[PDB]
Subunit: 560 residues, 3 copies
C-alpha cells in the first residue's frame, strides 16, 4: 500500500496565525495564595462564515516592444454577457494617466468570446479564462471567509473586502456599514446563476450581489442574515491549572497551554448576560468530565466554579482543588480554632500556606522553564521548515510560509498515488553539468483528468513549478520519498523502486545494533582529470554556512 500524495500551494495570507513566544518566568517563587484546580479556557467565538465568492476581472496587456494592469469588469457585462450569454466582452476599459482608456483583444474588434475552464484543474475554483493590446477576461469562483463583526470579509486571494457580505437593500440586512460608494455596489433581485461549462441555468432563483473594486469585481450569493450564535466558545479543557496571586492580579499557568493569563482578581459576573447558560452548562460539564477522570479519588472541590476575564479576550473558568493529604492540615487547624467547609477557609493559615506556596512555585517555574525550552525550539523549527511544523500543528498536511513574523496557512490537495508518474531520467539535456536535484513527476488531480507537469518535493510533496536544480555532480546516489516507499536514483537515472522495508530504520532514540562498516571513498577517476565536482549529498549546516563563504570570495574577485 502507498500513502496519498499532497500538492501544497503557496498560501496568499488569507489565514494568519501568530505563534506564542517565550514568557518571562520568575527566578524565585514570589507568588501568593497558590492553588491547583481544573480550568477550561474559552476563545471568543469568531463565527467563521464561508461562501464561494466569484471574482471577475480583466487583464489588459500590450505587445509593444507595456503599462499592464488589472481592471474590474462592469456589472452589466457580468449580468448580460457572462451570465445571460456565458461570454466576456472583448473590449475593456482601464485607467491610464488619470484618464479612461480602451483596450482590445489582440488588436482586434469587439467580438463575443466564451469563458473556458482553467487548465490548473485545482479545487479552489474553475478559474474560467478566455485566453490561455491583449485583453483577457478571467472568472474565478474562489472561496471567502468572514469574521464575527461581519463588516468586512477576506477572499481566498487575501485581499480584504471592506463590504459586509450581508449588505444590500432587498431587506433589512447589514446596511449600517459600507466603505465603498453606492455606485460601486449593486444587488440584483431574483437573479439566476449558471455554470459556464454547461450553461444549464440555475435550478432556483438566487439573488446575486456585485461589488466593483479598484482592481477587480466580486459577486456572491446574498443570504438575508445568518442567525445568532453563542458569543463564547470552548478552546481547551486543561487537565491541571495553577493560579498565582501577585501584584494585585492572578497568574494562571498550565503544562498544556504554554501561555500565562492575567486577571483582575474579581470574578466576572457571567450571569449578567443570557450567554451564561450556553457557557455555564458547557463549562460546568467540562469540570465533571475532567474531575471524574482522575481528580475524583485524590482531590476535593473547593466551592463552586469561578469565572475571570483574561488579557487578550480569553475567558477562563476555574475550579480550585486541593490534594487529600493537604486537607488533613486544613481540617486539623480548623479543629484547633474550634476548641470540611473548605470554602472561604483556603489561605487562612499562613504557616500551612507557606510551604505549599513554595512547593507549587517550583512546579509553575518548572513548567515555565520547560515550556520556554520547547517554545524557543519550536519557533526556530517553524522558521526552518514551516511546512513540517504546520502539518504537525493542524493535525493534517497543510502548507505554510513565513510572512515576516506571522505564519500563513493554506490547504493542500490530496491525490492518490495511482495518478502520479515519475520521470525515469531526471537529468536535463538543455544544459550539461546542471539538472534537477529531485525527480520530475507528472500527475492528474483526479482519475482520467488532464496531465500536468511538476516536481517531486520532500515528504511526498508535489510542486507545480520545476525549479529545484543544482550543479549535478558525478557519482550521485540519493533516495526520494515516493508514496509508501522510496525511489532509488543513481547517477541521475531511475534505477528501481524499493519498499519501506528495504531500508534499515532507526526508530528508537539510540540504536547501536546497526551493521555499519568502514566506508571507502570510491572517488571516480573522471573528477581527477576533468576537474569537475563530486557528489556530497544535501549540504550540512556547516557546509551551507561554508558554501556561502566561497561565494563571498567570488564577488570580491569579480569586484576587484
Amino acid at each position: 500500500t502507498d500513502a496519498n500524495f499532497y500538492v501544497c500551494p503557496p498560501p496568499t495570507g488569507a489565514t494568519v496565525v501568530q505563534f506564542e513566544q517565550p514568557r518571562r518566568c520568575p527566578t524565585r517563587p514570589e507568588g501568593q495564595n497558590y492553588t491547583e484546580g481544573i480550568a477550561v479556557v474559552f476563545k471568543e467565538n469568531i463565527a467563521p462564515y464561508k461562501f464561494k465568492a466569484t471574482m471577475y476581472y480583466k487583464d489588459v496587456t500590450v505587445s509593444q516592444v507595456i503599462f499592464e494592469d488589472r481592471a474590474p469588469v462592469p456589472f452589466e457585462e457580468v449580468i448580460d454577457k457572462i451570465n445571460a450569454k456565458g461570454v466576456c466582452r472583448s473590449t475593456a476599459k482601464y485607467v491610464r494617466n488619470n484618464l479612461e482608456t480602451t483596450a482590445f483583444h489582440r488588436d482586434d474588434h469587439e467580438t463575443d468570446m466564451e469563458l473556458k475552464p482553467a487548465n490548473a484543474a485545482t479545487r479552489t475554483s474553475r478559474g474560467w479564462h478566455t485566453t490561455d493590446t491583449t485583453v483577457n477576461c478571467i472568472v474565478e469562483e474562489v472561496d471567502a471567509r468572514s469574521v464575527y463583526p461581519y463588516d468586512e470579509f477576506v477572499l481566498a486571494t487575501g485581499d480584504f473586502v471592506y463590504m459586509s457580505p450581508f449588505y444590500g437593500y432587498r431587506e433589512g440586512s447589514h446596511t449600517e456599514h459600507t466603505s465603498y460608494a453606492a455606485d460601486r455596489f449593486k444587488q440584483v433581485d431574483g437573479f439566476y446563476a449558471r455554470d459556464l461549462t454547461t450553461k444549464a441555468r440555475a435550478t432556483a432563483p438566487t439573488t446575486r450581489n456585485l461589488l466593483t473594486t479598484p482592481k477587480f469585481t466580486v459577486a456572491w450569493d446574498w443570504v438575508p442574515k445568518r442567525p445568532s450564535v453563542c458569543t463564547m466558545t470552548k478552546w481547551q479543557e486543561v487537565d491541571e491549572m495553577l493560579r498565582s496571586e501577585y501584584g494585585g492580579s492572578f497568574r494562571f499557568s498550565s503544562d498544556a497551554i504554554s501561555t500565562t493569563f492575567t486577571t483582575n482578581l474579581t470574578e466576572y459576573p457571567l450571569s449578567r448576560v443570557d450567554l451564561g447558560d450556553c457557557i455555564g452548562k458547557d463549562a460546568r460539564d467540562a469540570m465533571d468530565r475532567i474531575f471524574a477522570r482522575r481528580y475524583n479519588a485524590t482531590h476535593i472541590k473547593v466551592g463552586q466554579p469561578q469565572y475571570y476575564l483574561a488579557n487578550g479576550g480569553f475567558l477562563i473558568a476555574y475550579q480550585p482543588l486541593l490534594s487529600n493529604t493537604l486537607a488533613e492540615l486544613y481540617v486539623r487547624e480548623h479543629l484547633r480554632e474550634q476548641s470540611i467547609e473548605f470554602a472561604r477557609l483556603q489561605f487562612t493559615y499562613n504557616h500551612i500556606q507557606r510551604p505549599v506556596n513554595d512547593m507549587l512555585g517550583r512546579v509553575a517555574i518548572a513548567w515555565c522553564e520547560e515550556q520556554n525550552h520547547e517554545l524557543t525550539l519550536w519557533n526556530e523549527a517553524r522558521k526552518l521548515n514551516p511546512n513540517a511544523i504546520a502539518s504537525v500543528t493542524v493535525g493534517r498536511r497543510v502548507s505554510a510560509r513565513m510572512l515576516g513574523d506571522v505564519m500563513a496557512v493554506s490547504t493542500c490537495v490530496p491525490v492518490a498515488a495511482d495518478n502520479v508518474i515519475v520521470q525515469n531520467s531526471m537529468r536535463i539535456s538543455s544544459r550539461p553539468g546542471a539538472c534537477y536535484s529531485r525527480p520530475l513527476v507528472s500527475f492528474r488531480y483526479e482519475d482520467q483528468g488532464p496531465l500536468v507537469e511538476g516536481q517531486l518535493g520532500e515528504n511526498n510533496e508535489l510542486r507545480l513549478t520545476r525549479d529545484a536544480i543544482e550543479p549535478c555532480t558525478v557519482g550521485h546516489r540519493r533516495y526520494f520519498t515516493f508514496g509508501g516507499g522510496y525511489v532509488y536514483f543513481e547517477e541521475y537515472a531511475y534505477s528501481h523502486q524499493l519498499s519501506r522495508a528495504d531500508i534499515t530504520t532507526v526508530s528508537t532514540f539510540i540504536d547501536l545494533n546497526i551493521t555499519m562498516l568502514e566506508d571507502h571513498e570510491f572517488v571516480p577517476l573522471e573528477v581527477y582529470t576533468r576537474h569537475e565536482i563530486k557528489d556530497s549529498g544535501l549540504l550540512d549546516y556547516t557546509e551551507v554556512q561554508r558554501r556561502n563563504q566561497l561565494h563571498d570570495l567570488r564577488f570580491a574577485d569579480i569586484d576587484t
Copy 2:
C-alpha cells in the same frame, strides 16, 4: 587529559538508514478494548556477514591536450602478476567506441611494476597503488557486507554486487543464483594469498574467488557455507506498551518506540516453526525481567503471552497487564454475576471498560503528540547537522551525510591527541584578505606513522581536505575545540591553548549568575579607512538568510 580525535570520512552509501516520520494521532480516543502490558518487539534477523573483499582495477588516462575510464583487471593477471609476482601489468585493455583498445604506462612499453601501499594510511585497506596514455593499477582490500538472502552483497564502496559470496563449483555451495555470466566469474582451488608489502605468501591454503565487473574486479576468501542461525532476533524490550483495537486491527503504541504497529487481531501460530523455542524462551525471559522490575508489585498477568505479526516485518510478543486497583472492579463485577480468573474476562463489562478506554486513550494520544514533537524536531536536526545526530543515535562518533531522503553511515577513525599538531598561523599568504576560517592541523594515523595535512573541524573532527575558507576580516577572535580543551586564536594567529576550566560553562538550562557586562564595540580604525569588512563570528540564521539576499542583488547588477 585530552579526548581522542576523530577523522570522519564521507560515507559512500554502503549502509542506508531511513529515520521514522511523524505519524497521524487521533484527535479523540476512538479505540476499543484498551489494555496495558509488557511488549518485546523483534526485528528480522538480517544475518550480517562481513568479509574483506579485495578489489582490483586499472585506471587509464591520457595526457593529450581524454576519454578516461576504469576497467577491470583479468583473472590471469591477478593470479600471475599480482599474486605470484606482486606486480601489475603495465598494459591494460579498455573499451572505446564499442571496440577493445590497449593502453600503456606513460607512453612506455610493457614492464613489471610493483604495487606500493597507499599514502592515506587508512584502516579501510592498504589500497596498494603503483603510481601516486597513463595506466595505473590499484588494489584495495576494502570491506564488504551481505544480508540474510546472501544472493547479493555490498562492498564498502557501495556498489552492489549481484553475485553471492558463497557462489562457486568447488562444493555444493550457493550455486542456485548468479546474474553474471560464467566467464565473468572464476574460482581457484588451493589458492594462496599474500601481502604485497612483505610478499611472504599465505601460511595455509586459502581458496580465492574472482569476479570481473564492467568497472572493476573483486576477489575474496571463499568460505564453503555459513551455518544456519535464528530467523528472528530481539530489537527492544519495551517497558510499557498499550494495545488498541480499531478498524478490525490492533494498534500498538509505546513511549520509547515512536512508531505504531498494526496487526490482524489473530495470534500468529509461532509454534508451527522450530524457531518458537529460540524466540519463545528469549521472549518469555524478557517478560519476567521487565515484569519483575516494576510490574511485580502493581500489576497482575492477564493469561499467557501472545504473539502477533506487524506491518513491515516486525514480530511483537505481548503480555496484557492490568493495574491492581483496576482488578478490584473486575472481581467486584465477577462476584455480582456469580450470585481471579482474569483470563477471558477482560472487556466483558462495557461500563467498567468505558472509562479505561478513554483514560488510556489520552495516554496514547499524549505519547503520539509528544512523539511527533520530537520526531518533527529530530528530523530537522538531522538535516541541519547529521554528524551530531548520527553520533548521538549510534552511541559513538560516526559520520553521516544526507543522501536525499535517506541517511548514510560510515565509521570514523579515532586518533590520540598526541599525534596531531596545529599550525600556529592559520592565515594563508597565497591570497590576502582571504584565509582558512578554522585552524590547520597535521597528524599521523598512528605513532611514528606518516604525516598528513588536514583541517580542524567542529567537535574535534578532522577533515582530510582543507577547504573551510572565508573572507578573513580584521579584529577576529574565535575559539576552536582541540582535544580536552580549546585553542584561542586572535587576528588569525595562534595565541595560546586554554583548558576547559578557563571558560565559563552554562550547564543548567537557566543560569543568571553570569558576570556579563556591557560590551563596547571597539571597531578598528582600519575598517573606516580601508573600507574592509569587520569580524562577526559565525553567521546567525537571520544573518545567513540575509547574506544570500545581498548575493541575489549582486547577480542582478551583473546581469543588468
Copy 3:
C-alpha cells in the same frame, strides 16, 4: 500596553561562555553501589570585581590619495590637557618604520581642542571624541572586569590587560606581579577627576592609575585592596542526584544538571580549611531545605553529609538517601543476621543491592539519553539563533554571537516603546527593485534625547546599522513585531498597526480548530510581462538550501 524594545550591540568577547556537549551514556548499567540523595554543587568563587576603567587613545589617519593606526596618549597629556584642561593635544606621536613619527590635525598646527561627548548616546560610556594627517583624540569610560587571581583584568573592549587593577606603589597593594615595564605605568596620589561635559572637578580626592599599552592608554580609580571573601560559592541546589561507583571513581548524575562528575572515592577533608564553616553551614542548610520539601515523608537520611572534589574545580556535597520501601529490605536482612543504623550498612547485602543497582541504572541512563537529546538539539539551536537561546538562558534579553566554538555575551539596552518611530515607506528610492526587507525605525535612547537612525529587527530587536535588504518583489505581504503588537506592511508600505489580539494564535501544540481555507494564488499580471520575481516570504530551509544552488550555477556560467 506595549513591551519595551531592546537594542542588542555586537559582543566583543569580554565574557566567554562554553556550552555543555553530549556525554557518553552506558549502553547497559555497569555501575556499582547505586544510591540516591540530595546534592548541592558549588562553583569556584571567581570574585568578579568591576570598575569603570577609562580608556584614552589617539586615532591617526592620512588623507593622501594611508598607514593608519591607534597610538596611546602619554600620561602628562591626560593629567595636564584632558584632566586639568578638558582638551586633547592636536599633535600625536605614532611609530612608523620602527621610528617615532609626528602627526597633526587636518594638516594644522598644535592647538587645544576640547573633547565632545559621543553621538551614540549609549550606556557603555560617554565616549568623548573631538572629531566626529588627521589625528583624533577619543576618551571612553568603558567598563572592566577582573577575576579571582586579580593579576589580570579584561576591559569591555575584550582586550586583556596584563596589569593588576590594585597594582601601585602608594601602599602595600598587589605589587607582586606586573608584565609591563615600570615606565609603562604611573600612579598619581591625590589625583582629582572630572567630567569633560561639565568640568566641575571631583568632589573628593580620587587617586588615579595610568597604564600605556602598545595601542591605547587606560586609567581607573585605584582602590587600595578589596577585602577577602568565601573561596567557594553555591551553584545549584539539585533536587535529586544519583551516585555511581565504577572504575575506582564515583559518577554523579542528575536530571537538572546535564553533566556528569567524577571523584576519587575519598571524602575531601573540607574541615582542614577555615572556609568549612562558610560552606558547611551553607551546604547543610540546603540539605534541610530540599529534604524538608519532599524527601521528609518518603526518605531517610543515610548518615551525615559527604564532600567530594570533582573534575573541573566543582565541589559537591552529597547526602545519601534511600526510599522508605527500600528500608524494609535492609532492616529485614539486618534482623536476620542479628539472630535503623543505616550508616555503614548500605551495600552490605549484595542480593538486595543487585536489583537497585539495575533499577537506578535505567534512571541514570534515561536521564543521560534524554539529556543528550536536548543537548544535541540545544547546541544546534544556539548556532542557528544564538540571540534567542542567549535570552532564554540568562533570564533576560541578552546579545550573543558565535565566536567559533565559544559563546559571547553582552548586555542589551532597553528602551521604551514611546521613543521609537517606524518609517511609513520602507522602500528605498536609491535603487529600484531592491529595498530593505524589514521596516526602518528612528529612536532615542531616552526621553528628549538625540534621534538616531536604525532598522527594526526580529523579536523587537533594534539594529544600529540598516543593512537587511533583498530584491524587493511584487505583491509583498508581511508582518513585523512592534512593541506589544504587530505592524502590517503590504507592497512595502505601512498600512496600519494591529494589536496582538487581531491575529489568530496557536498556543497549544495541536490546534485543529483553525478556520483555514483553500488559498488561491493571485499572481499579479505584472510578473508575467515584466519577468520580475514574486514574493515568497522568508526562505524555507529547503528554499535557502536551494537558492544557493542557483547561485552555484551562476558562477559556473560566469567562469565559463
